[PDB]
Amino acid sequence: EYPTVSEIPVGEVRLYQIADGVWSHIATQSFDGAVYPSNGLIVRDGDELLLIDTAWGAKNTAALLAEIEKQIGLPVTRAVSTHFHDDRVGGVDVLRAAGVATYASPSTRRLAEVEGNEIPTHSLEGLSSSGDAVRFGPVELFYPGAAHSTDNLVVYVPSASVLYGGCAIYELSRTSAGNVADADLAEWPTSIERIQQHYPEAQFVIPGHGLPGGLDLLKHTTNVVKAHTNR
Numbered sequence: 001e002y003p004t005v006s007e008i009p010v011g012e013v014r015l016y017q018i019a020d021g022v023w024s025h026i027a028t029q030s031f032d033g034a035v036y037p038s039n040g041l042i043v044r045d046g047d048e049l050l051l052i053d054t055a056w057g058a059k060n061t062a063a064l065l066a067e068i069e070k071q072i073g074l075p076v077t078r079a080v081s082t083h084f085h086d087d088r089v090g091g092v093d094v095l096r097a098a099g100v101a102t103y104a105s106p107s108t109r110r111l112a113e114v115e116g117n118e119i120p121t122h123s124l125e126g127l128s129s130s131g132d133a134v135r136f137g138p139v140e141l142f143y144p145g146a147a148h149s150t151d152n153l154v155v156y157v158p159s160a161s162v163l164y165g166g167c168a169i170y171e172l173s174r175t176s177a178g179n180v181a182d183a184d185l186a187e188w189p190t191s192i193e194r195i196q197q198h199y200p201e202a203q204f205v206i207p208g209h210g211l212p213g214g215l216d217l218l219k220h221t222t223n224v225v226k227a228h229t230n231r
């Protein structure tokens with residue numbers, strides 16, 4: 001079963017096999033007085049691993065590397081952070097100390113700097129305009145437009161039809177929004193429509209927080225977001 005928030009003590013990381021060579025990582029952390037789960041992705045990249053997003057903080061990210069070493073045994077050589085918040089870049093300094101080359105878009109690196117968050121070393125080119133896609137080893141990176149944040153990226157694994165939506169996509173059980181401090185509530189439905197247009201064959205859809213699903217999470221997120229702007 002996919003692990004749930006109450007099953008992961010803060011500081012522990014679970015790995016979940018989605019497909020051959022594709023895993024999610026699941027961790028937990030406190031935000032504004034409660035503990036939340038958070039998802040990232042791991043994708044086999046030949047003899048190496050590509051990591052999508054930290055495990056939300058330095059302690060969790062160290063535990064992530066240890067679990068990967070224990071369970072998979074291939075080196076994590078590159079990481080991509082899909083936006084500038086701490087559940088995506090928090091732990092970048094641990095990754096770098098461990099020998100991982102860290103990447104994000106120029107906008108994400110800039111916003112992390114402004115926020116006083118950790119800053120990935122390398123800039124991903126070719127993602128500056130809504131609708132842009134670039135290949136990055138075994139995945140495609142896609143900038144759908146502003147949504148949860150103005151820099152948020154999604155990731156697609158063609159070999160397995162896996163769409164990682166990051167924080168732009170909500171789990172089915174989540175019916176209210178927040179944290180939308182950095183969100184663009186007007187653009188978010190449009191950004192989701194771009195994801196749908198570009199990845200219509202996605203079979204597994206992973207939200208930034210919570211249980212995976214299918215393309216129904218896209219329509220579900222639009223409904224939640226619109227309800228939030230309706231009142």
Ligand SMILES: Nc1nc(C(=O)O)c(CCc2cccs2)s1
Nearest residue numbers: 031036087167174178179209210
């Ligand atoms: N670091 C965090 N980010 C978010 C987000 O909204 O992206 C959090 C809330 C996530 C969840 C709310 C209800 C179930 S999961 S915490």
Ligand SMILES: [Zn+2]
Nearest residue numbers: 083085148167
């Ligand atoms: Zn965020």
Ligand SMILES: [Zn+2]
Nearest residue numbers: 085087167208
């Ligand atoms: Zn988040």
